[PDB]
Amino acid sequence: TDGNAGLLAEPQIAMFCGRLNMHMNVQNGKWDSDPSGTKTCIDTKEGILQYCQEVYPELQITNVVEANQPVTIQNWCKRGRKQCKTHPHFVIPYRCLVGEFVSDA
């Protein structure tokens, strides 16, 4: 039965102003557009953390950081996940960092 956790992609978000935010589909490794069909680029770190939590509600995301590598992404969409174009844009995505909760006195 021996495992391969690496078959799951890392949770991350990517932004390009003028288009809906993208995020990594953990299960299939593809970049998908915004689940609500409405969210566009975010200009605060706190907003990006909130967005990670919205897209990955069960992952215990507690922090975010820019990824090491720039990434090319196709299929950016407008509101409603409409007028999706194959035109590529490269951006630096943000990794959604899973937190390990511990107890305090």
From Swiss-Prot:
Residue positions annotated to bind heparin are 75-89
Q: Region annotation GFLD subdomain: residue ranges?
A: 7-102
Give the disulfide map: C17-C41, C52-C96, C77-C84
Q: E1 domain: from which residue to which, for each copy?
A: 7-105
- Where is coiled-coil annotated? none
Q: What is this protein called?
A: N-APP
To which species is this protein native? Answer: Homo sapiens
